[PDB]
Amino acid sequence: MKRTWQPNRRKRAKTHGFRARMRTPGGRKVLKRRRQKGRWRLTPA
Amino acid sequence: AVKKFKPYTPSRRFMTVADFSEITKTEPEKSLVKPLKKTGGRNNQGRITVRFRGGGHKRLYRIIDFKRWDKVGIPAKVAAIEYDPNRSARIALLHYVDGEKRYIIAPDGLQVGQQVVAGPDAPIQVGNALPLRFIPVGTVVHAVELEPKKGAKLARAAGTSAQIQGREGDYVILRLPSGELRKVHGECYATVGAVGNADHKNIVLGKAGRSRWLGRRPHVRGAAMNPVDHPHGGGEGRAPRGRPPASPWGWQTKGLKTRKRRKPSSRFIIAR
RNA sequence: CGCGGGGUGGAGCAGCCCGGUAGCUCGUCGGGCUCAUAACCCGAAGGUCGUCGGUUCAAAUCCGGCCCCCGCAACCA
RNA sequence: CCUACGGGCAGGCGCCGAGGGUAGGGCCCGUGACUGGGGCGAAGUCGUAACAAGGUAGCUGUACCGGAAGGUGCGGCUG
RNA sequence: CACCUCGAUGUCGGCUCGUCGCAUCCUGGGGCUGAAGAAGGUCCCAAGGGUUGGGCUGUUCGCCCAUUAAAGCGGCACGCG
RNA sequence: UGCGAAUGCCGGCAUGAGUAACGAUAAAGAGGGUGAGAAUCCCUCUCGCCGUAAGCCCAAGGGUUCCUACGCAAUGGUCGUCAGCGUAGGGUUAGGCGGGACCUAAGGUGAAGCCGAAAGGCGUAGCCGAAGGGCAGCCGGUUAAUAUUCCGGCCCUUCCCGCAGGUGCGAUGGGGGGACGCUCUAGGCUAGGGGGACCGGAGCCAUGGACGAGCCCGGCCAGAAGCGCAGGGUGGGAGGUAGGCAAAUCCGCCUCCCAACAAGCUCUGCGUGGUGGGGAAGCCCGUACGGGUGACAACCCCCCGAAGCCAGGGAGCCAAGAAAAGCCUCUAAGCACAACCUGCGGGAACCCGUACCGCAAACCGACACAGGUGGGCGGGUGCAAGAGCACUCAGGCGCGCGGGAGAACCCUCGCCAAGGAACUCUGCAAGUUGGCCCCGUAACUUCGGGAGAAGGGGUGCUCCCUGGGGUGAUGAGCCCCGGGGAGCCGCAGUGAACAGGCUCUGGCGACUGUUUACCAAAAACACAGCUCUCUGCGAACUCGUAAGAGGAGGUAUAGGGAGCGACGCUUGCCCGGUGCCGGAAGGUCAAGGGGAGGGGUGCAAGCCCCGAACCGAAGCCCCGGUGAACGGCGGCCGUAACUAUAACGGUCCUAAGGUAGCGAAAUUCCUUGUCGGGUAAGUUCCGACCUGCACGAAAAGCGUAACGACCGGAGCGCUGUCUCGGCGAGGGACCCGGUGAAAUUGAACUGGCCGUGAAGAUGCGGCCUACCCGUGGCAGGACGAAAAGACCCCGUGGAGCUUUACUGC
RNA sequence: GGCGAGCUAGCCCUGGCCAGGGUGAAGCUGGGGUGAGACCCAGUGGAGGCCCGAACCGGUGGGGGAUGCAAACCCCUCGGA
RNA sequence: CGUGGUUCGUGGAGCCAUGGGGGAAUCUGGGCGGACCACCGCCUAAGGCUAAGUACUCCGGGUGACCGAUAGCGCACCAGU
Ligand SMILES: NC[C@@H]1O[C@H](O[C@H]2[C@@H](O)[C@H](O[C@@H]3[C@@H](O)[C@H](N)C[C@H](N)[C@H]3O[C@H]3O[C@H](CO)[C@@H](O)[C@H](O)[C@H]3N)O[C@@H]2CO)[C@H](N)[C@@H](O)[C@@H]1O
Ligand SMILES: [Mg+2]
Ligand SMILES: [Mg+2]
Ligand SMILES: [Mg+2]
Ligand SMILES: [Mg+2]
Ligand SMILES: [Mg+2]
Ligand SMILES: [Mg+2]
Ligand SMILES: [Mg+2]
Ligand SMILES: [Mg+2]
Ligand SMILES: [Mg+2]
Ligand SMILES: [Mg+2]
Ligand SMILES: [Mg+2]
Ligand SMILES: [Mg+2]
Ligand SMILES: [Mg+2]
Ligand SMILES: [Mg+2]
Ligand SMILES: [Mg+2]
Ligand SMILES: [Mg+2]
Ligand SMILES: [Mg+2]
Ligand SMILES: [Mg+2]
Ligand SMILES: [Mg+2]
Ligand SMILES: [Mg+2]
Ligand SMILES: [Mg+2]
Ligand SMILES: [Mg+2]
Ligand SMILES: [Mg+2]
Ligand SMILES: [Mg+2]
Ligand SMILES: [Mg+2]
Ligand SMILES: [Mg+2]
Ligand SMILES: [Mg+2]
Ligand SMILES: [Mg+2]
Ligand SMILES: [Mg+2]
Ligand SMILES: [Mg+2]
Ligand SMILES: [Mg+2]
Ligand SMILES: [Mg+2]
Ligand SMILES: [Mg+2]
Ligand SMILES: [Mg+2]
Ligand SMILES: [Mg+2]
Ligand SMILES: [Mg+2]
Ligand SMILES: [Mg+2]
Ligand SMILES: [Mg+2]
Ligand SMILES: [Mg+2]
Ligand SMILES: [Mg+2]
Ligand SMILES: [Mg+2]
Ligand SMILES: [Mg+2]
Ligand SMILES: [Mg+2]
Ligand SMILES: [Mg+2]
Ligand SMILES: [Mg+2]
Ligand SMILES: [Mg+2]
Ligand SMILES: [Mg+2]
Ligand SMILES: [Mg+2]
Ligand SMILES: [Mg+2]
Ligand SMILES: [Mg+2]
Ligand SMILES: [Mg+2]
Ligand SMILES: [Mg+2]
Ligand SMILES: [Mg+2]
Ligand SMILES: [Mg+2]
Ligand SMILES: [Mg+2]
Ligand SMILES: [Mg+2]
Ligand SMILES: [Mg+2]
Ligand SMILES: [Mg+2]
Ligand SMILES: [Mg+2]
Ligand SMILES: [Mg+2]
Ligand SMILES: [Mg+2]
Ligand SMILES: [Mg+2]
Ligand SMILES: [Mg+2]
Ligand SMILES: [Mg+2]
Ligand SMILES: [Mg+2]
Ligand SMILES: [Mg+2]
Ligand SMILES: [Mg+2]
Ligand SMILES: [Mg+2]
Ligand SMILES: [Mg+2]
Ligand SMILES: [Mg+2]
Ligand SMILES: [Mg+2]
Ligand SMILES: [Mg+2]
Ligand SMILES: [Mg+2]
Numbered sequence A: 001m002k003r004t005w006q007p008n009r010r011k012r013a014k015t016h017g018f019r020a021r022m023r024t025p026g027g028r029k030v031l032k033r034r035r036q037k038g039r040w041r042l043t044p045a
Numbered sequence B: 001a002v003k004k005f006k007p008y009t010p011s012r013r014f015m016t017v018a019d020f021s022e023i024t025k026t027e028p029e030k031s032l033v034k035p036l037k038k039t040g041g042r043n044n045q046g047r048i049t050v051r052f053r054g055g056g057h058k059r060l061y062r063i064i065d066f067k068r069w070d071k072v073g074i075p076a077k078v079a080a081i082e083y084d085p086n087r088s089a090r091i092a093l094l095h096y097v098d099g100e101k102r103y104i105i106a107p108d109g110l111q112v113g114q115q116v117v118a119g120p121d122a123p124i125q126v127g128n129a130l131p132l133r134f135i136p137v138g139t140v141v142h143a144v145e146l147e148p149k150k151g152a153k154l155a156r157a158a159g160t161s162a163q164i165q166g167r168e169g170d171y172v173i174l175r176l177p178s179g180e181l182r183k184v185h186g187e188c189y190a191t192v193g194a195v196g197n198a199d200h201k202n203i204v205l206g207k208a209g210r211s212r213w214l215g216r217r218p219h220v221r222g223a224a225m226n227p228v229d230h231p232h233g234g235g236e237g238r239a240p241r242g243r244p245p246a247s248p249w250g251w252q253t254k255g256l257k258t259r260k261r262r263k264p265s266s267r268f269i270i271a272r
Numbered sequence C: 001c002g003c004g005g006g007g008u009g010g011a012g013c014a015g016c017c018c019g020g021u022a023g024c025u026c027g028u029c030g031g032g033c034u035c036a037u038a039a040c041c042c043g044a045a046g047g048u049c050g051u052c053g054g055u056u057c058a059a060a061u062c063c064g065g066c067c068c069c070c071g072c073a074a075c076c077a
Numbered sequence D: 001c002c003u004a005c006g007g008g009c010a011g012g013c014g015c016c017g018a019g020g021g022u023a024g025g026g027c028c029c030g031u032g033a034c035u036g037g038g039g040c041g042a043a044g045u046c047g048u049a050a051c052a053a054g055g056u057a058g059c060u061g062u063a064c065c066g067g068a069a070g071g072u073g074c075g076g077c078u079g
Numbered sequence E: 001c002a003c004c005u006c007g008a009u010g011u012c013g014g015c016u017c018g019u020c021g022c023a024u025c026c027u028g029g030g031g032c033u034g035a036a037g038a039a040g041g042u043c044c045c046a047a048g049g050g051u052u053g054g055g056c057u058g059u060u061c062g063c064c065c066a067u068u069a070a071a072g073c074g075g076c077a078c079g080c081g
Numbered sequence F: 001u002g003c004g005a006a007u008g009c010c011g012g013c014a015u016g017a018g019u020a021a022c023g024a025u026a027a028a029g030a031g032g033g034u035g036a037g038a039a040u041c042c043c044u045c046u047c048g049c050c051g052u053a054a055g056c057c058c059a060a061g062g063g064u065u066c067c068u069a070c071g072c073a074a075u076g077g078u079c080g081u082c083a084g085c086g087u088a089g090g091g092u093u094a095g096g097c098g099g100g101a102c103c104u105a106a107g108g109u110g111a112a113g114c115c116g117a118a119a120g121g122c123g124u125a126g127c128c129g130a131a132g133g134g135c136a137g138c139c140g141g142u143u144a145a146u147a148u149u150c151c152g153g154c155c156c157u158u159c160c161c162g163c164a165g166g167u168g169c170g171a172u173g174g175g176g177g178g179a180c181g182c183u184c185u186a187g188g189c190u191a192g193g194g195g196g197a198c199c200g201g202a203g204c205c206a207u208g209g210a211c212g213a214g215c216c217c218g219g220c221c222a223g224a225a226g227c228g229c230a231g232g233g234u235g236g237g238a239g240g241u242a243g244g245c246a247a248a249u250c251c252g253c254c255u256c257c258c259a260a261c262a263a264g265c266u267c268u269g270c271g272u273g274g275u276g277g278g279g280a281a282g283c284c285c286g287u288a289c290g291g292g293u294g295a296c297a298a299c300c301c302c303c304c305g306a307a308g309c310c311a312g313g314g315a316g317c318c319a320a321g322a323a324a325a326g327c328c329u330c331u332a333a334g335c336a337c338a339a340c341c342u343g344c345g346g347g348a349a350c351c352c353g354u355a356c357c358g359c360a361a362a363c364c365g366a367c368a369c370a371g372g373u374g375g376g377c378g379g380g381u382g383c384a385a386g387a388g389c390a391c392u393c394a395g396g397c398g399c400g401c402g403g404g405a406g407a408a409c410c411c412u413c414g415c416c417a418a419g420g421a422a423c424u425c426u427g428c429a430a431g432u433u434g435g436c437c438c439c440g441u442a443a444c445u446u447c448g449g450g451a452g453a454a455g456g457g458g459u460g461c462u463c464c465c466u467g468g469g470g471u472g473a474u475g476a477g478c479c480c481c482g483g484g485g486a487g488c489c490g491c492a493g494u495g496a497a498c499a500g501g502c503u504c505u506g507g508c509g510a511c512u513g514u515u516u517a518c519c520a521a522a523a524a525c526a527c528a529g530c531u532c533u534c535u536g537c538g539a540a541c542u543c544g545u546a547a548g549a550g551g552a553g554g555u556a557u558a559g560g561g562a563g564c565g566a567c568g569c570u571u572g573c574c575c576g577g578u579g580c581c582g583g584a585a586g587g588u589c590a591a592g593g594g595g596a597g598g599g600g601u602g603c604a605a606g607c608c609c610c611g612a613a614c615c616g617a618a619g620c621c622c623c624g625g626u627g628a629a630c631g632g633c634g635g636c637c638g639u640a641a642c643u644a645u646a647a648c649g650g651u652c653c654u655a656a657g658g659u660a661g662c663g664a665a666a667u668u669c670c671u672u673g674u675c676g677g678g679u680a681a682g683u684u685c686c687g688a689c690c691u692g693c694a695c696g697a698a699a700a701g702c703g704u705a706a707c708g709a710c711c712g713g714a715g716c717g718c719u720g721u722c723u724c725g726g727c728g729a730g731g732g733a734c735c736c737g738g739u740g741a742a743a744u745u746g747a748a749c750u751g752g753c754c755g756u757g758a759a760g761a762u763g764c765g766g767c768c769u770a771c772c773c774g775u776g777g778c779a780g781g782a783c784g785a786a787a788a789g790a791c792c793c794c795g796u797g798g799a800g801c802u803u804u805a806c807u808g809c
Numbered sequence G: 001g002g003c004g005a006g007c008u009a010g011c012c013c014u015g016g017c018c019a020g021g022g023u024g025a026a027g028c029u030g031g032g033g034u035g036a037g038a039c040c041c042a043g044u045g046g047a048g049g050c051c052c053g054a055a056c057c058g059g060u061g062g063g064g065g066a067u068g069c070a071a072a073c074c075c076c077u078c079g080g081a
Numbered sequence H: 001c002g003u004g005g006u007u008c009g010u011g012g013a014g015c016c017a018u019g020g021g022g023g024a025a026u027c028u029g030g031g032c033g034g035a036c037c038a039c040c041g042c043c044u045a046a047g048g049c050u051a052a053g054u055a056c057u058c059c060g061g062g063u064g065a066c067c068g069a070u071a072g073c074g075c076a077c078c079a080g081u
């Protein structure tokens, strides 16, 4: 029955995307973090 | 003067609708002078700040005219009386000789045909806006201004009036629909007559649904909540208030007065 | 079994707290007014205070046991 | 089968049909825990409404109230 | 009373399947009788086997209806999830 | 720095075990081929299953899964030569299809501006934002794999430039327009489908008959201009003009004059059309798919016909139904050797997607998971209709372990003599009933209902006669609705499939609705409606530190809070306490004002400190009001000419002592109260009494038609629920081949009884019994498994909740 | 201090969907009716949180499932439509 | 008056800072030495700049009674995979 993943490409980028992580200071930090740990991916694809 | 239905379905039984005879040919409520897209929206920026709202028919705002002094001395003929869904009252469409068209909140009386005028001049007959200092004592008048040039704000709901009981200083004394006794400035534009479509008080929605068409969602009694969400929520099978009855936010809701006292406007009031 | 209150002329209640006075209304008895009754007025009578103890100089009153009356509780299971 | 056969009788099917069954109505009678008023029955209880301004003139339609008669409001009549 | 069990011993009633005891409800054998016969009373032996169908209530129990030779009382983690 | 325990951590390997399972009971069988190997790959034939799908096209999502060659270690629940798997190579073509060099929507962002300790929050215009608006391609063929994309045919839009002809041209600005709901719905058409005796077509005559107006197959598709057909759109001229934030010659408005019609003009739809292309059965080829022929195919009449199109059509209704651009008109700067408009001609026309899966083995569910997933198409026949049901077309499937066997037992099914709720907590379950037409139908009622009440009859086929409609002509055909009559057959004609059991009577809730996603669907919530209360509008109220916003572009016939809950009849008494409301007096009271009076130090001037009276708010006190505000609404004793009983009285208390109505109740402890009813029997049910442990009037009181997957009682019908079981079917269980888990597990060589033992012993004691080891079965025991008991206590453990607990904000 | 409304709840903008049958409100027309009316009766008409019933939305009772096909499923039955 | 800082938690509570209120002087002026006064002294507020000694280790070197693949950084290995 309707599970919790209902992937939709526009929402995923609108929500977790790069351009979005960067307006909220709280997320510019998510990037700062992810970059420091050396995540090969700063954001979802 | 209000339509009744045989009970061919429960709710149709007691249900009762408006009379739309005053409505001179209408439907297409004329674009130009209104409509204007209306923003149905039940909360402010984010959060619900008036409870139990939303849903209900889509709506087109009729941009109605509340300052009437805008067109002193220019008369106008009255072309339509039509259904406005954003007020208890019905609205008169009036063609000016100026060429200009706008809407007015339709007084009890205006037949489709009258010339209507506004200004210190102007004959005292239903539909004509004057300043208040020039309207003769004892006249019922409506769509009143509270301070000169600020727009009509008093007595504009179907059937509401306001008698002018006296004059004193640059001010006149009205009885507003609330029974209150208020001094209003003399220069404030009022417009002679009562508001009309006055049976509106007597409609009976009839079923739950009708209350939603109207845009009002179900309203749940504190009584029926838990104590987390309302100062009346608990017991174990219906337990009296058990305190002086209260609103979700805590303040007492039976009797406790609310008007800010220091208000400047106090020095211009006198009743209930 | 638990807790609290109570028992006072015939009825219903004070007095018990703070030791030493027994009081109120009704009723009962005698006498008036009335043709008569009632109402009304004038007079009087009647209690050992549930009981056994104990304290005190002295106990309705302070203490304890027993006898009754009424009320409250008896929950997790 | 009989004949005096292009016949009759037996026999067969059919309509109607007393009544039997199933179903649901109507009307009347009897009866029933209990309950409502009513009549009647020498000397039971409570008050005093009415009859004499009945000691608050009476009566009256209505309405509310009250152990009970009754009282009260509104209007009416005069008996 | 608080002894094993709170790093779990699932609690009433029914149903199913029983098994045991005897302080015997019936049937078998008896003594005594205020036992004429018939039918009973009371006590003794006896556990082979039997010990009904319904109404009410979740009930066990009990009341009741119709019968019956009788419509037994208990134990088994108030036998048995 | 030494391990055996920490339900320790990490890893390895065991037990259960060749055990359960191998994922829908739509179903398989044989021949042939390939290969080391074949139930599992290919092919043929036969069988079965989907067909409002289990077929087909689109959108999401997915991301090489597409196509071909080669291959099988692993993935595939078996096998595997096969594959969505491995390796490699190929494959996605657009001015017109979708999106972008267009528009705006909620919302976002945001010059100006506002606010906030910083971070930041708001915000006019603007900008961004789409499945909405705007916008030009239809059809056939070709590829192993793409196609409205390549090709072919016919058709079209925009930009640039030029030539002609026309005009005051010109816009981010003005106006028109775009531009709009729901239900019903006219006409004409189209998609779609059926029939034909007509036109085309390979063949076919079996098995008793048929060479026949036989059978079987097919009889269209796209298409400019013109033209028909249907429908939408719309008045024309003149003057005045102060409104549409400049200006208009435009629009608005006033007068007047002409048509009032679609006449005219315009637009779309359908038809026809040049041209283009398709084109079955069957037979042959060879598939792993398709190709040849049929053929020079034919290509036509009739009927049924949308929910689609003409479209902005029409009527009714109340809840009263986006924006902006494209478009057109108007003008302003500006320019008018410009520019625009029209026609023609040349040229120019960019970016992204396009494979494939897409109700699923390619998406969301760890899985090739019986679950979930939006739009469109969805044929035929019958059944009254229909997207229902049965069968079926096209198309797609037999669900990736099999073979046998024919036990118990389990699941899903069918049937049962007599009985018929006797079962049980309860008719749970299952049965009965069941579509359509006709007859018929009660109490009660708010007059609509109750109603499918109830209870009944009819239902197939054949022949004869016969009425009306649509289409054609008024006719035949064809399609539709019937009416009457004589017959035939079976156990039975809605002959299969989909298709209510019913009545009586209480409780609660008026009603449709809503709810604890995943143990509660309810008598709970909501609900129209009633009442109280607040709020005069920069409203109250809510969110926010603010700005601001919601309320509301509302205004007391409105908005907030609270209770009650359709409707009928009603809703009593207490304001002493608490709440709120009112009260210009008085009492108290903080800072502050005020300083009489005192003190510290100085030689002194001074400097500095304490401080009475008195003037100083709200709050509280105090005075009053208020009950659809929180709330409350008595005790003893006596009394009548049998007796009981008490209308009457006495007395104590109170703020006042419960009115109407109701009452063993969703409330009654005693209690299975008592009486009546129902039953052979009634702790329940119904009626009644009142002794109300502990009913009672907006946490409403008492009723109420209708309504209910609520809950209680009773009856009829019918039954495997039962007396009481039996038989039968299929899927498992069993055996054989292939693959092969799990909780659990100190170690085991793991018996009964009677004892004992930490009080319930395979493990101690005595006695008894007992050859070793499996398999199918049953669940009494291993205080069997699971979960560090949820109950209970304990911890100066936690957390949600409350208030006249404390203390704060 | 940050991350979440791609599940779920509410609201906002914009689209879409609901076979087929039944019942027959107003209004309208006609007839009766009256001084005029109310009203009556036909026909027409097509209203409704109206009825039956698929899609679709549900989740009533029961059975099965319970190391499942499934960390909520399956079958029969049932509610709205 | 309200608070912060200092060892200072209103304490006899100064000093330094300052949200609010009132509000000077310029050497004979001002601040300070722990309520306040005197005396005796210290120091020049309301403007500013200033190397070094000091902190740290992404990074480079050198050492080790530091680890030796369950250790040692999570990663000795194409791991923030
Ligand atoms: N029969 C009279 C009717 O009913 C009522 O009358 C009845 C009663 O009111 C009346 O009762 C009366 C009473 O009022 C009066 N004040 C006392 C008197 N003793 C009683 O009377 C009764 O008493 C005894 C019993 O002991 C009987 O034997 C006697 O017959 C009977 N009348 O007795 C009547 C019936 O017996 C009304 N009074 C009257 O309005 C009406 O007309
Ligand atoms: Mg869904
Ligand atoms: Mg994921
Ligand atoms: Mg997941
Ligand atoms: Mg999207
Ligand atoms: Mg890298
Ligand atoms: Mg409510
Ligand atoms: Mg609750
Ligand atoms: Mg919360
Ligand atoms: Mg909250
Ligand atoms: Mg609270
Ligand atoms: Mg409460
Ligand atoms: Mg309660
Ligand atoms: Mg006494
Ligand atoms: Mg006396
Ligand atoms: Mg005397
Ligand atoms: Mg004594
Ligand atoms: Mg408790
Ligand atoms: Mg009587
Ligand atoms: Mg009198
Ligand atoms: Mg008298
Ligand atoms: Mg009198
Ligand atoms: Mg009277
Ligand atoms: Mg009395
Ligand atoms: Mg009078
Ligand atoms: Mg113990
Ligand atoms: Mg002990
Ligand atoms: Mg254990
Ligand atoms: Mg014996
Ligand atoms: Mg029973
Ligand atoms: Mg036994
Ligand atoms: Mg016991
Ligand atoms: Mg037991
Ligand atoms: Mg070890
Ligand atoms: Mg050890
Ligand atoms: Mg070890
Ligand atoms: Mg390994
Ligand atoms: Mg085994
Ligand atoms: Mg087995
Ligand atoms: Mg097996
Ligand atoms: Mg399978
Ligand atoms: Mg396909
Ligand atoms: Mg791949
Ligand atoms: Mg191959
Ligand atoms: Mg392999
Ligand atoms: Mg394999
Ligand atoms: Mg598998
Ligand atoms: Mg492939
Ligand atoms: Mg491959
Ligand atoms: Mg496409
Ligand atoms: Mg460009
Ligand atoms: Mg834009
Ligand atoms: Mg912002
Ligand atoms: Mg854009
Ligand atoms: Mg579009
Ligand atoms: Mg396009
Ligand atoms: Mg093609
Ligand atoms: Mg393809
Ligand atoms: Mg022009
Ligand atoms: Mg066609
Ligand atoms: Mg056709
Ligand atoms: Mg030929
Ligand atoms: Mg032959
Ligand atoms: Mg021939
Ligand atoms: Mg055809
Ligand atoms: Mg004109
Ligand atoms: Mg055409
Ligand atoms: Mg054409
Ligand atoms: Mg051709
Ligand atoms: Mg094939
Ligand atoms: Mg229209
Ligand atoms: Mg724009
Ligand atoms: Mg142009
Ligand atoms: Mg493609």
Ligand SMILES: [Mg+2]
Residues within 6 Å of the ligand: none
């Ligand atoms: Mg494709």
Ligand SMILES: [Mg+2]
Residues within 6 Å of the ligand: none
């Ligand atoms: Mg496909």
Ligand SMILES: [Mg+2]
Residues within 6 Å of the ligand: none
């Ligand atoms: Mg689909």
Ligand SMILES: [Mg+2]
Residues within 6 Å of the ligand: F360
């Ligand atoms: Mg697939």
Ligand SMILES: [Mg+2]
Residues within 6 Å of the ligand: none
């Ligand atoms: Mg498919």
Ligand SMILES: [Mg+2]
Residues within 6 Å of the ligand: none
């Ligand atoms: Mg999957």
Ligand SMILES: [Mg+2]
Residues within 6 Å of the ligand: F368
């Ligand atoms: Mg599979």
Ligand SMILES: [Mg+2]
Residues within 6 Å of the ligand: none
């Ligand atoms: Mg699946």
Ligand SMILES: [Mg+2]
Residues within 6 Å of the ligand: F383
């Ligand atoms: Mg049918």
Ligand SMILES: [Mg+2]
Residues within 6 Å of the ligand: none
């Ligand atoms: Mg079907």
Ligand SMILES: [Mg+2]
Residues within 6 Å of the ligand: none
């Ligand atoms: Mg089939």
Ligand SMILES: [Mg+2]
Residues within 6 Å of the ligand: none
């Ligand atoms: Mg096929």
Ligand SMILES: [Mg+2]
Residues within 6 Å of the ligand: F416
């Ligand atoms: Mg039978």
Ligand SMILES: [Mg+2]
Residues within 6 Å of the ligand: none
């Ligand atoms: Mg039979």
Ligand SMILES: [Mg+2]
Residues within 6 Å of the ligand: F420
């Ligand atoms: Mg029967």
Ligand SMILES: [Mg+2]
Residues within 6 Å of the ligand: none
């Ligand atoms: Mg029974």
